């Protein structure tokens, strides 16, 4: 209640009283005081000598003259004595007068050191360190930890009497696509659970708040007009988006993004529009794909079934590997005989991504050889570097203990499968660490060969076969050639010189019997035809054939029925750094050097109520995830990722890349509280609009980004922006909130001292950043052009988006809560007499 009276505390107690009752003599947060707060007293004991008359800019720790309890005063006195070379300690029976005289001595010698040592910085550090020793002011009162990635979270109370500026009518949690109405959707049964959880990392954005929802749409419009807005260059806009962390945010965002793409880009009218803005989800629940399909196929999800199938049938260690038939049937699309003009559901397919099956491997290495107590993905840079030593040796072993086997086999399937958009991971062609595109992996040659051949040969219907041979099994996968959807189609000239056969085994012990025959039906267009190898497993790796002349001596022929026939002389198991099993790829002889069997999207009207259609034109696309979490930091400008991308767009065009998925371009925060802010990938940020504008991002300056987008567009490659509405990191201004310790679903942890309790968070942006410039700056334009976006009543809330408020400054009122900050349950100071919080 406004008046810190200093009585029976410190011998010097009438000089230490507060300068005035003004708030400007206290370092306060929302007019509360913290254990680390400093204040301006009336007099300063200058050099610990003379009670200097004035105080001006002379702020001193409040813990120098005031304490919450006598026990804390004693702890402070013992601590500060040790810090200042005063060899006296006071145990739990010493009395008040002794403590006040000790505190006076400590004050005097503090002021001596302040005038000796130039500044007060050391005192800030020493006071905060002491405060961290106190359980009411550190992690101890925030325990027990839980399986939140960062050990826990607190949820901000919607009605806090002491913090009404942080109140909310929303904070509706866990409204995943499965759980969007607050009840588990009865349509979707592949996932038993509620399909996600609200609290993932750092400060959790409340995407149930209509004002926030509107600001998310503002941001989306900004990214898709980045060229126009920042550089007045319409050739430098992002073309599409990736929706990050779908299962940790309110699913209303899916309708908002879809609606926006329909209204602003017309993706629902024809395939040309849709494919010009092909947008994706990172949505891990198996309900998300049927959900997104019922929603209109306005975006596409990953095929997680196919992914797991590749992982467990090919990538895992030999003794943990599953049988091979899942590669055919355990997918969105059963590829036994895929003869459809248009598959039932669109999707993209991958084996590794910047996060998936990379940071998992680094964590495995750390947990098993460095620090067994590693928490989630909260690595230190030192742990990361020691782990990449192990990782990089394992990559080249024949017997891998940590990294994937059979990468080239995985890509042989991904890049010749029908009915999916493959997404190539950067770190599978180039090293996961090091400078951008500086070092090829051992699989670069095979993968590049596959990408080029995909342009030239991959089209038509598909047939996958699983054949038990000798002591093991193989699969064949065949594409019939352009224009041949069914195996009986005899084709035209281009059919004859396209199509492909892939043969794989996942067991190095594979031995065929002398009587075994692998009869690969190529299709009715390929009777009595010469075929040559594209990829062949060898003893030490994979031989790639880049031309018909490079393979001139290995030609073989189909019989009169269009069958290639293989025996033990052709197929056996191998064990080398690239293959644990067997891989062979064959193409028909004689395709023109410029043969291109891809197909452009039609402008014919769409008539089935979906926007994206998995047909030959979409199957003609290739997505490229163009970064690695663990890229080195550029040492000179020519090593900047976006600079290098601009310098190699010819390479991406020759690989058939149609969609370049760039890293998130937001300037990263540097708090190091998660992997993303340690290696600074772009997913941990404080300013949604700072795309390398105030400072370069890890990939270059904003002009480097503009030039990279233009260079990609100059080859017809579309460019994808990473929409990250889940969380934000490292806000520069503190705020006092009413909070409750919770699990990642928002359920309160009992036995917790944080329960409708004052808590100090970092949750205000500066008001002088890009957010303050652009926040809500396009809502009037968007409402004017597209009123129906603001008319829709969103599913989770029952109301429209609310664009009547612009978010120029983030504040706790717009967030569900935060990961625990190690500040404790009692950081906000109370008058001990009245058990009342101090306020000004
Ligand atoms: C942090 C990163 O992963 C997050 O999701 C993880 C899931 O919680 C895992 O369980 C795993 O999914 C399995 C499902 O739980 C399971 O039910 C099944 O349906 O599918 C999986 C097993 O087959 O997947 C994730 C492991 O990475 C989170 O949802 C995801 O969005 C996160 N990655 C992006 C987001 C951020 C934060 O902005 C960044 O940390 C990353 O770099 C982004 O890529
Ligand atoms: Ca969330």
mmCIF file with all atom_site columns, N, CA, C and O in Angstrom, residues 105-120:
data_model
loop_
_atom_site.group_PDB
_atom_site.id
_atom_site.type_symbol
_atom_site.label_atom_id
_atom_site.label_alt_id
_atom_site.label_comp_id
_atom_site.label_asym_id
_atom_site.label_entity_id
_atom_site.label_seq_id
_atom_site.pdbx_PDB_ins_code
_atom_site.Cartn_x
_atom_site.Cartn_y
_atom_site.Cartn_z
_atom_site.occupancy
_atom_site.B_iso_or_equiv
_atom_site.pdbx_formal_charge
_atom_site.auth_seq_id
_atom_site.auth_comp_id
_atom_site.auth_asym_id
_atom_site.auth_atom_id
_atom_site.pdbx_PDB_model_num
ATOM 1  N N  . UNK A 1 105 ? 26.849 -2.763 7.723   1.00 0.00 ? 105 UNK A N  1
ATOM 2  C CA . UNK A 1 105 ? 28.239 -2.962 7.307   1.00 0.00 ? 105 UNK A CA 1
ATOM 3  C C  . UNK A 1 105 ? 28.309 -3.366 5.836   1.00 0.00 ? 105 UNK A C  1
ATOM 4  O O  . UNK A 1 105 ? 29.128 -2.836 5.064   1.00 0.00 ? 105 UNK A O  1
ATOM 5  N N  . UNK A 1 106 ? 27.411 -4.275 5.433   1.00 0.00 ? 106 UNK A N  1
ATOM 6  C CA . UNK A 1 106 ? 27.338 -4.730 4.050   1.00 0.00 ? 106 UNK A CA 1
ATOM 7  C C  . UNK A 1 106 ? 27.027 -3.568 3.135   1.00 0.00 ? 106 UNK A C  1
ATOM 8  O O  . UNK A 1 106 ? 27.621 -3.430 2.061   1.00 0.00 ? 106 UNK A O  1
ATOM 9  N N  . UNK A 1 107 ? 26.103 -2.700 3.551   1.00 0.00 ? 107 UNK A N  1
ATOM 10 C CA . UNK A 1 107 ? 25.775 -1.545 2.726   1.00 0.00 ? 107 UNK A CA 1
ATOM 11 C C  . UNK A 1 107 ? 26.986 -0.655 2.525   1.00 0.00 ? 107 UNK A C  1
ATOM 12 O O  . UNK A 1 107 ? 27.278 -0.225 1.398   1.00 0.00 ? 107 UNK A O  1
ATOM 13 N N  . UNK A 1 108 ? 27.697 -0.367 3.623   1.00 0.00 ? 108 UNK A N  1
ATOM 14 C CA . UNK A 1 108 ? 28.860 0.508  3.571   1.00 0.00 ? 108 UNK A CA 1
ATOM 15 C C  . UNK A 1 108 ? 29.912 -0.051 2.631   1.00 0.00 ? 108 UNK A C  1
ATOM 16 O O  . UNK A 1 108 ? 30.477 0.677  1.799   1.00 0.00 ? 108 UNK A O  1
ATOM 17 N N  . UNK A 1 109 ? 30.162 -1.352 2.713   1.00 0.00 ? 109 UNK A N  1
ATOM 18 C CA . UNK A 1 109 ? 31.225 -1.900 1.882   1.00 0.00 ? 109 UNK A CA 1
ATOM 19 C C  . UNK A 1 109 ? 30.769 -2.064 0.420   1.00 0.00 ? 109 UNK A C  1
ATOM 20 O O  . UNK A 1 109 ? 31.584 -1.901 -0.511  1.00 0.00 ? 109 UNK A O  1
ATOM 21 N N  . UNK A 1 110 ? 29.456 -2.240 0.196   1.00 0.00 ? 110 UNK A N  1
ATOM 22 C CA . UNK A 1 110 ? 28.908 -2.180 -1.157  1.00 0.00 ? 110 UNK A CA 1
ATOM 23 C C  . UNK A 1 110 ? 29.196 -0.837 -1.785  1.00 0.00 ? 110 UNK A C  1
ATOM 24 O O  . UNK A 1 110 ? 29.630 -0.752 -2.936  1.00 0.00 ? 110 UNK A O  1
ATOM 25 N N  . UNK A 1 111 ? 28.898 0.232  -1.057  1.00 0.00 ? 111 UNK A N  1
ATOM 26 C CA . UNK A 1 111 ? 29.077 1.558  -1.627  1.00 0.00 ? 111 UNK A CA 1
ATOM 27 C C  . UNK A 1 111 ? 30.549 1.838  -1.878  1.00 0.00 ? 111 UNK A C  1
ATOM 28 O O  . UNK A 1 111 ? 30.911 2.535  -2.842  1.00 0.00 ? 111 UNK A O  1
ATOM 29 N N  . UNK A 1 112 ? 31.412 1.321  -1.000  1.00 0.00 ? 112 UNK A N  1
ATOM 30 C CA . UNK A 1 112 ? 32.840 1.431  -1.242  1.00 0.00 ? 112 UNK A CA 1
ATOM 31 C C  . UNK A 1 112 ? 33.213 0.812  -2.579  1.00 0.00 ? 112 UNK A C  1
ATOM 32 O O  . UNK A 1 112 ? 33.825 1.473  -3.432  1.00 0.00 ? 112 UNK A O  1
ATOM 33 N N  . UNK A 1 113 ? 32.778 -0.435 -2.809  1.00 0.00 ? 113 UNK A N  1
ATOM 34 C CA . UNK A 1 113 ? 33.103 -1.122 -4.063  1.00 0.00 ? 113 UNK A CA 1
ATOM 35 C C  . UNK A 1 113 ? 32.489 -0.419 -5.274  1.00 0.00 ? 113 UNK A C  1
ATOM 36 O O  . UNK A 1 113 ? 33.105 -0.366 -6.342  1.00 0.00 ? 113 UNK A O  1
ATOM 37 N N  . UNK A 1 114 ? 31.258 0.085  -5.141  1.00 0.00 ? 114 UNK A N  1
ATOM 38 C CA . UNK A 1 114 ? 30.635 0.840  -6.228  1.00 0.00 ? 114 UNK A CA 1
ATOM 39 C C  . UNK A 1 114 ? 31.513 2.020  -6.622  1.00 0.00 ? 114 UNK A C  1
ATOM 40 O O  . UNK A 1 114 ? 31.743 2.264  -7.812  1.00 0.00 ? 114 UNK A O  1
ATOM 41 N N  . UNK A 1 115 ? 32.055 2.755  -5.638  1.00 0.00 ? 115 UNK A N  1
ATOM 42 C CA . UNK A 1 115 ? 32.885 3.902  -6.012  1.00 0.00 ? 115 UNK A CA 1
ATOM 43 C C  . UNK A 1 115 ? 34.285 3.483  -6.415  1.00 0.00 ? 115 UNK A C  1
ATOM 44 O O  . UNK A 1 115 ? 34.914 4.172  -7.228  1.00 0.00 ? 115 UNK A O  1
ATOM 45 N N  . UNK A 1 116 ? 34.737 2.323  -5.945  1.00 0.00 ? 116 UNK A N  1
ATOM 46 C CA . UNK A 1 116 ? 36.018 1.778  -6.373  1.00 0.00 ? 116 UNK A CA 1
ATOM 47 C C  . UNK A 1 116 ? 35.911 1.245  -7.783  1.00 0.00 ? 116 UNK A C  1
ATOM 48 O O  . UNK A 1 116 ? 36.650 1.661  -8.677  1.00 0.00 ? 116 UNK A O  1
ATOM 49 N N  . UNK A 1 117 ? 34.924 0.395  -8.018  1.00 0.00 ? 117 UNK A N  1
ATOM 50 C CA . UNK A 1 117 ? 34.844 -0.357 -9.254  1.00 0.00 ? 117 UNK A CA 1
ATOM 51 C C  . UNK A 1 117 ? 33.994 0.331  -10.295 1.00 0.00 ? 117 UNK A C  1
ATOM 52 O O  . UNK A 1 117 ? 33.266 -0.358 -11.007 1.00 0.00 ? 117 UNK A O  1
ATOM 53 N N  . UNK A 1 118 ? 34.068 1.661  -10.426 1.00 0.00 ? 118 UNK A N  1
ATOM 54 C CA . UNK A 1 118 ? 33.472 2.349  -11.570 1.00 0.00 ? 118 UNK A CA 1
ATOM 55 C C  . UNK A 1 118 ? 31.940 2.329  -11.705 1.00 0.00 ? 118 UNK A C  1
ATOM 56 O O  . UNK A 1 118 ? 31.352 3.342  -12.087 1.00 0.00 ? 118 UNK A O  1
ATOM 57 N N  . UNK A 1 119 ? 31.281 1.196  -11.446 1.00 0.00 ? 119 UNK A N  1
ATOM 58 C CA . UNK A 1 119 ? 29.873 1.015  -11.806 1.00 0.00 ? 119 UNK A CA 1
ATOM 59 C C  . UNK A 1 119 ? 29.160 0.090  -10.815 1.00 0.00 ? 119 UNK A C  1
ATOM 60 O O  . UNK A 1 119 ? 29.763 -0.448 -9.876  1.00 0.00 ? 119 UNK A O  1
ATOM 61 N N  . UNK A 1 120 ? 27.874 -0.161 -11.100 1.00 0.00 ? 120 UNK A N  1
ATOM 62 C CA . UNK A 1 120 ? 27.012 -0.991 -10.260 1.00 0.00 ? 120 UNK A CA 1
ATOM 63 C C  . UNK A 1 120 ? 26.651 -2.334 -10.891 1.00 0.00 ? 120 UNK A C  1
ATOM 64 O O  . UNK A 1 120 ? 25.800 -3.051 -10.342 1.00 0.00 ? 120 UNK A O  1
#
